[PDB]
Amino acid sequence: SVSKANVPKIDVSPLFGDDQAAKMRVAQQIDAASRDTGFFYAVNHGINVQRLSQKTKEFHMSITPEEKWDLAIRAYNKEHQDQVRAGYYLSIPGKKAVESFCYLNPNFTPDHPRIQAKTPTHEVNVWPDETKHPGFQDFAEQYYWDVFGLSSALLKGYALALGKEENFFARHFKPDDTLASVVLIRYPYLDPYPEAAIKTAADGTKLSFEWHEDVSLITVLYQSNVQNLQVETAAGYQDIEADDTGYLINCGSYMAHLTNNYYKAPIHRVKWVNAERQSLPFFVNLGYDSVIDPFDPREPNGKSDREPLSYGDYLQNGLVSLINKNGQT
Numbered sequence: 001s002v003s004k005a006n007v008p009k010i011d012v013s014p015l016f017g018d019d020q021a022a023k024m025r026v027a028q029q030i031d032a033a034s035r036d037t038g039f040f041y042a043v044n045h046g047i048n049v050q051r052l053s054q055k056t057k058e059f060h061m062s063i064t065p066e067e068k069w070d071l072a073i074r075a076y077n078k079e080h081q082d083q084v085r086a087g088y089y090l091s092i093p094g095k096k097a098v099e100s101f102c103y104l105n106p107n108f109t110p111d112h113p114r115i116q117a118k119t120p121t122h123e124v125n126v127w128p129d130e131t132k133h134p135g136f137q138d139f140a141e142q143y144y145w146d147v148f149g150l151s152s153a154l155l156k157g158y159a160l161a162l163g164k165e166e167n168f169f170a171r172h173f174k175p176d177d178t179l180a181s182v183v184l185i186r187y188p189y190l191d192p193y194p195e196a197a198i199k200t201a202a203d204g205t206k207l208s209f210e211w212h213e214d215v216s217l218i219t220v221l222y223q224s225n226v227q228n229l230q231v232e233t234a235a236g237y238q239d240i241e242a243d244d245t246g247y248l249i250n251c252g253s254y255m256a257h258l259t260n261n262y263y264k265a266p267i268h269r270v271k272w273v274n275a276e277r278q279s280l281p282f283f284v285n286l287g288y289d290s291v292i293d294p295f296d297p298r299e300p301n302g303k304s305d306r307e308p309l310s311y312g313d314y315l316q317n318g319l320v321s322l323i324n325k326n327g328q329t
């Protein structure tokens, strides 16, 4: 009785090459998906996702409680005042099932100018001990650059789809400064599954995480093959089918702002499923000072009555609001 959502599979391959015509055909597909339910799967993206889930499972399953406190964000561990974003997000057995590990740009090192200035939302990543987790940091840092690569190609597709030159977004999405992050989220199988860890939607649907719009320009998501996501449409909440060979793509509210809502940030929520699974989002965030002037591809002159908003401001307020609305993850 819940209908299936329209989530097209788009071969994003041409976005890596120089066939400008082929790129326009991919852009049209992005345009259609963005104006409809606001989700699509990127296929032929070139990333080894099987290796990704394997390396990630090895980490989630071998990290100990000790290590988690030692890596924990400030919300779980008051000693770690600089860890607002990056580090470990603990489960609370009996109360909160989900747990995760977030890391930012590998280039945010101690000598980075934004780290030196202590600019909000910039942090140096924390990692487990190499001997307990051999290869993990290097795997994870490589993965950041692989998915960064996929996201630049996708940003060229969205730029072309909106009537712009292909670097419109991508020129603000740079290795030395992107606020992009990876979150390795573990959703556990639990028996018994704690009721306090299950939320209930107004329509009676059991959830693991409530309705929201994403805090990003776009979101580039790998998940396990366990159906869980629902997107709200004019026909109501519809199920997004799982596909663990592709990346699920959608826009965040930053894109909605820029396009004066021509590409909406789709409202979605995460159904409660009692299954051991992974949700591995890459939040495509720009630079702290990145400002794109808002426009409207539905108006003849392209003008919008929205004001410019720097990415850093959007991100910092956005992530705080998401915590307040939907709880500390």
Ligand SMILES: N[C@@H](CCCC(=O)N[C@@H](CS)C(=O)NCC(=O)O)C(=O)O
Binding pocket: 085, 086, 102, 180, 181, 183, 185, 209, 212, 214, 215, 270, 279, 281, 283, 319, 322, 329
């Ligand atoms: N710490 C991250 C941002 C994490 C944002 C977040 O909490 N996303 C929610 C909604 S997209 C989540 O993904 N909830 C669950 C789920 O399965 O999606 C980094 O600093 O940028």
Ligand SMILES: [Fe+2]
Binding pocket: 212, 213, 214, 268
């Ligand atoms: Fe989301």
